[PDB]
Structures are given as C-alpha cells and as structure tokens.
C-alpha cells in the first residue's frame, strides 16, 4: 500500500457534516464508509442518510449513541436511502425507510479490522474509508484546530469517525462536527507510536462495509 492515501482526492468523500447535539456519530461514521465504497464500486459519489440509520438501527440508541457495525449491518441487510430523500433532522424519529420508496444503495456485508493493529487498519484504509472509534471527550481533541494530533488523550473511546486516508505519520479522519472544527472538519491523528491501542484508542474497533 502507498505512503499516502486520501479518498477525498479520489472523489470518494462527501462534504463534512455536522451531527449537531445528537449522539449520532456512529451513523455519520457508517455513512462515510457507505458513501466511499459506493463511489469506489460504481464511480458515483452520493450522499446517504445518517437519519435513516439513526431512526432504523434498532441495536443502536438513536441520539444516545450506537454502533457503527450495527448501522453497517443494517445497510447490508436492507439498504440505505439518499440523504436528500431522508434528510438529517438531528433527532431520532421513527424509521421511515418504507415511506421513502426503494433503497438507493445496498452493501453486501460488514467486516471488522483486526483490532490493536495499525498495519491492519492502514491496509483497510488503503482499500476504502473505514469506520473507527476514538476518545473525543478530552478538551485537547475538542479544541483541535489543526496539525498532527498526538493527544493528550486516553483510550476511553466514545466517538465514531471515519478514516479516509493516512500518511507516514498520521491517519486522516473525517469528523462530523462541521467544517469549522479541526482542518476543515478533518483531523490528522498521529500513527506509528507503537501504542497498540492507537492514539486516543484509534485502533479499538474498526469496521468497513463490503460491496461486491
Ligand atoms: C458518539 C457521538 O455522537 O458523540 C461522541 C461523543 C456517540 O456518543 C456514540 O455512539 N458512542 C458510542 C461509542 C462508539 C462509537 C461505539 C457508544 O455506544 N458509546 C457508549 C458506550 C458505553 C455504553 C460503554
């Protein structure tokens, strides 16, 4: 795999979103990976509905948080609608998939990246955007405005984001806190520290959709 990967330059990443006060990071994270893999397979970059996952993933807890892997299993089992069809409202409502007509996209499964393994994660990122978790509660992460982020942070992972690239010293992360946060909505987090948890626990729990 190459020294640099940046799915934004391959046109596989949609604009940065703001999840608002809703604890819907897990859905935003999942959708980034779906938007990425659909563009990789079909050549079309579309935006898909975080709201649908919020509303429809019964294993997750709506705005109280949830699981990227569940949301990704939902899209593999059922599918997902366009974001324009099922726009984000920032509150959990009832699952409206049936009222929104046929699904716009469907994946074929979910895979987990071997945890606590930087190389495994980089390999996955080189193939497609990956859903990753990290500890975002620390003020240093919250106040990040740019640069390669090294912490401080612990491994009390609490926030799902998407890894859309990497370089020799960092993993490139699309956050869901709007374009005002970090580097136009992105964070580069240090890699290669030999910490098997990853910086801020970044290697704890990583998943990606499979699309044939
Ligand atoms: C993420 C978010 O929108 O805000 C981050 C502060 C959610 O809070 C979320 O879904 N968190 C998620 C942790 C990873 C992403 C799976 C979660 O389920 N946290 C609660 C875990 C606890 C019950 C042990």
Swiss-Prot record:
Coiled coil: none annotated. GO terms for biological process: proteolysis. Disulfide bonds join 22-63, 56-95, 153-200. Optimum temperature is 50 degrees Celsius. Unstable upon 65 degrees Celsius. The active site is at 25, 159, 175. It comes from the Eukaryota. Repressed by the active-site-directed cysteine protease inhibitor E64 (L-trans-epoxysuccinyl-leucylamide-(4-guanido)-butane) produced by Aspergillus japonicus. Inhibited by the inhibitor of cysteine proteases from Trypanosoma brucei (TbICP, rhodesain) and Colocasia esculenta cv. Kaohsiung no. 1 (CeCPI, tarocystatin). Repressed by leupeptin, a peptidic cysteine, serine and threonine protease inhibitor. Leupeptin binds at residue 25. Its EC number is 3.4.22.2. Keywords: Allergen, Disulfide bond, Hydrolase, Protease, Signal, Thiol protease, Zymogen. One of its GO terms (molecular function) is serpin family protein binding. It catalyses: Hydrolysis of proteins with broad specificity for peptide bonds, but preference for an amino acid bearing a large hydrophobic side chain at the P2 position. Does not accept Val in P1'. E64 binds at residue 25. Optimum pH is 4. Cysteine proteinase with a high level of diversity in substrate specificity, an amino acid bearing a large hydrophobic side chain at the P2 position is preferred. Belongs to the peptidase C1 family. This is Papain. It comes from Carica papaya.
């Amino acid at each position: 795999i190459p020294e640099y990967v940046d799915w934004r330059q391959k046109g596989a990443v949609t604009p940065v979103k703001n999840q608002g006060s809703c604890g819907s990071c897990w859905a935003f994270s999942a959708v980034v990976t779906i938007e990425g893999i659909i563009k990789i397979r079909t050549g079309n970059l579309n935006e898909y509905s975080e709201q649908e996952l919020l509303d429809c993933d019964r294993r997750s807890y709506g705005c109280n948080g949830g699981y990227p892997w569940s949301a990704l299993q939902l899209v593999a089992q059922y599918g997902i609608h366009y974001r324009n069809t099922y726009p984000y409202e920032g509150v959990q409502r009832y699952c409206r998939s049936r009222e929104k007509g046929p699904y716009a996209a469907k994946t074929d499964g979910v895979r987990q990246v071997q945890p606590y393994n930087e190389g495994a994660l980089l390999y996955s990122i080189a193939n497609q955007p990956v859903s990753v978790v990290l500890e975002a509660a620390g003020k240093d992460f919250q106040l990040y405005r740019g640069g390669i982020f090294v912490g401080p942070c612990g491994n009390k992972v609490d926030h799902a984001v998407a890894a859309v690239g990497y370089g020799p010293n960092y993993i490139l992360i699309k956050n869901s806190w709007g374009t005002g946060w970090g580097e136009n909505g992105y964070i580069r987090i240090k890699r290669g520290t030999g910490n098997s948890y990853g910086v801020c626990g970044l290697y704890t729990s990583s998943f990606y959709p499979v699309k044939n």
